[PDB]
Design a protein around this ligand. Structure first.
Ligand code: FAD
Ligand code: FAD
Ligand code: APR
Ligand code: APR
Lengths: 401, 401
């Protein structure tokens, strides 16, 4: 930790990091560069309640635990020189740094086959994006969503609630293949289909002509608007240019260190060790941005502190489904607590590997999620008969560990 | 570049690195720690002429361009403390360092299904390994090789030349799936089959009982000796323990930097950017160990020097086949120069992507390999009709670029 500190990006990872720097006792300069001209804000509401109520003043991040920070909003960091220890800004200024933190997030992947489209085609990452999409959610209009991942499905539910007709094209044979157990994804598809979403599995978009999207089975889907949610790409261009190790994401260790001295990285832009798989992955979650920002700041101020150690988890709100997912999507065994039913959906899934909990899912069952995250953290090996048995309560199981 | 320099590992990457340090003009201390009690030696001969003639004094590396280096042979580095800047040795000594270089290579993967075997099962990486295997190559004995990669096939050819019966089990539908064009691998299989090797594709070993190996199709193969060549795993344990970013290999940038200040890594142990794919990969070649060692040393002595930039290539000697392979195994087009024939095999393959050369193969055609590596390096886009046409000579094509 050398002053001054400069952070590039003003999203959750950045705000969480700089708040922790202050709270841990660092009193030197902190400057944050954010390319969006927006008071820092949280993204999860964008495909959820914001989409419904439209009040951006309900989604702002709390920067009050980060006193004495200069936020340069609406400014783009164009490059940095890690020898000179400087950052070049789009407004023509240069910032010096002792420690540089890259917290620049990720951007939606574009669909190459719609690049020449003559119909609206949007992606959803920013407040500007959400406002643009929401304005097009005219009741009785037709929306096509490309991609059956979390953003696509949250938008699908939002659009159906709004009275919009929804079709959805997914290249895989299932939804949410990235980070969800098969049992969850099968149920989720039954849910969306029951709510009127026209799901097209094992299909791809091949092009579009005069307001109509073309598919690889030689068929057509007419739509008024297309939203593409086919994943993200790390915003790692400054790091690539400056000579850091990166591959769709900046490689970092548990201290947040890049391969370049005095340069760190946090949040969606990083590729990092998942302790449960033991492999490097991009972890594209809200809880990672917050918790990794906090851990890296803490260790910078106090090098005796441990490196980042938290295990991954996320949630998704898709209409009537409040989905929570921790750890790995599969092991060698799955245990199902409750009935999997479209009538008052409520269940929990537990993934085991040789008797040890490696992942858990809760659908409309928030009470079970915290105990299971604690069992997961210690790699508990509970009685499998007990885990299934509905009589068992999980909180007491966790507390006994 | 802070003195003293300590390198862990005494293989090609280490010798190449320390020779370049001296030649570039660094005059400070250099100490090399090597766990093998052997004068530093090259590995490619081990499955080639050494296997045939057995003289280790023909395979030693030249350490004379590395004057004033203390080589601690037969010593294992057990850990390093990157805060204290020290390395703990198996003989109870500690070394201080200004710059630490991890050049510890990779180890053969074991076969889990033969772990309890009661018959000889060997892998081939070291001089000790090669000596042990060679002693078992009794004429008219039966060898089973597990793995249809380069080491397995070079051993297969060696063993057939020695009068040994060879069977070979490969899980994939083809040989050399890791880094060879399909056209090459199809030919190579025809060659080995013609030389008497019993090839078993899309099979795995499930176990062994009383001298007989069991397969996943429910069948059996009797053998006197098993050699396992199913790939390697990076020797990255010290880096993992010390908190560096690693995932079956230490992540490094083009300067050789790890995520830990003052610690670098080189050779088989690294995961690095392949400039042709733009992805991070372990590059497990002789030319990488040498050229990456040289580039990293050069840039340490002279920070104005460019980072490592060479494109990948290797060769394999399999009986009558002198195979050379550069760049990517495939693109969107392959061009075949010459006839692919078991009678006096001699041909070249050229892989293109949108007209640009991205890879090349020469079989018994060394004269063409250097010109093609030069065309590849600049991403030439030669006349495809000309590349095919036998009248064209490639050296002049390269020189014109
Ligand atoms: C619609 C949507 C729904 C989501 N729902 C959930 C959810 O329910 N649960 C969950 O766990 N996760 C959810 N997420 C993911 C979560 O929001 C992200 O993991 C989190 O935003 C990552 O934070 P970050 O700080 O790393 O990156 P970001 O939030 O992307 O912030 C990075 C900022 O840096 C800026 N930047 C980039 N380059 C430069 C530059 N050169 N100069 C200046 N600034 C730059 C970017 O424009 C951006 O403003 C959702 C995301 C979206 C978009
Ligand atoms: C049989 C065989 C055939 C090959 N044929 C070819 C070929 O024809 N063409 C080609 O391009 N490539 C070939 N290769 C690959 C090539 O030899 C390697 O790419 C090269 O050896 C990598 O060099 P290196 O210095 O990175 O690692 P290594 O040669 O593995 O050297 C690393 C050294 O560090 C030692 N070490 C590990 N941990 C410690 C520790 N804690 N303390 C001290 N020492 C440690 C290791 O034991 C080893 O001696 C072949 C390899 C083998 C084994
Ligand atoms: N060309 C394509 N056509 C159709 N579907 C595609 C295509 N390419 C990928 N897909 C599918 O799109 C889906 C993308 O899912 P996610 O990776 O969850 O991506 P997205 O929903 O865009 O969200 C990106 C990120 O932001 C949120 O934090 C979200 O949790 C995710 O981490 C996957 O099911 C994938 O199979
Ligand atoms: N369980 C298995 N059973 C049978 N075959 C397997 C199995 N697992 C992997 N294989 C096959 O084994 C082969 C291993 O090939 P390489 O990766 O070339 O590994 P190996 O020949 O052991 O050599 C390791 C390294 O040393 C040399 O430098 C060589 O070039 C290579 O880089 C591949 O064709 C792969 O499909």
């Amino acid at each position: 930790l050398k002053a001054p500190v400069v952070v590039l990006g003003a999203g959750l990872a950045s705000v969480s990091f700089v708040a922790e720097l202050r709270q841990a006792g660092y009193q030197g300069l902190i400057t944050v560069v954010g390319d969006e001209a927006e008071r820092p804000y949280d993204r999860p509401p964008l495909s959820k309640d914001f989409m419904a109520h439209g009040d951006a003043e309900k989604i702002r991040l709390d920067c009050k635990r980060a006193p004495e920070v200069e936020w340069l909003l609406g400014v783009t960091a164009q490059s940095f020189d890690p020898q000179a220890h400087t950052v070049a800004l789009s407004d023509g200024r240069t910032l010096p740094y002792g420690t540089l933190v890259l917290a620049t997030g990720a951007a939606p992947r574009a669909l190459p086959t719609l690049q020449g489209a003559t119909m609206p085609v949007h992606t959803l990452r920013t407040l500007e994006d959400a406002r643009r999409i929401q304005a097009g959610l005219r009741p009785q209009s037709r929306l096509l969503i490309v991609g059956g991942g979390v953003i696509g499905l949250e938008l699908a539910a939002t659009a159906r609630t709004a009275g919009v007709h929804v079709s959805l094209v997914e290249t895989q044979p299932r939804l949410m293949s990235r980070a969800a157990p098969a049992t969850l994804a099968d149920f989720v598809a039954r849910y969306h289909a029951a709510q009127g979403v026209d799901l097209r599995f094992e299909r791809s978009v091949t092009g579009s002509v005069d307001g109509v999207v073309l598919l690889d089975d030689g068929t057509r889907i007419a739509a008024d608007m297309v939203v593409v949610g086919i994943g993200v790409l790390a915003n790692d261009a400054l790091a690539r240019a400056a000579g850091l190790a990166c591959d769709d994401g900046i490689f970092v260790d548990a201290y947040g260190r890049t391969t370049c001295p005095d340069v760190y990285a946090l949040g969606d832009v990083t590729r990092q060790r998942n302790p449960l798989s033991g492999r490097f992955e991009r972890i594209e979650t809200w809880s990672n941005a917050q918790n990794q920002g906090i851990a890296v700041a803490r260790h910078l101020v106090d090098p005796t502190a441990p490196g980042y150690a938290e295990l991954p988890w996320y949630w998704s709100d898709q209409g009537a489904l409040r989905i929570q997912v921790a750890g790995l999507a599969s092991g060698d065994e799955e245990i199902v607590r409750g009935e999997v039913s479209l009538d008052a959906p409520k269940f929990t899934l537990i993934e085991l590997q040789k008797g040890r909990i490696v992942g858990a899912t809760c659908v409309n069952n928030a009470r079970d999620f915290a105990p299971l995250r604690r069992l997961l953290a210690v790699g508990a090996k509970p009685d499998r008969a007990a885990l299934a048995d509905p009589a068992t309560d999980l909180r007491k199981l966790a507390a006994a560990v």
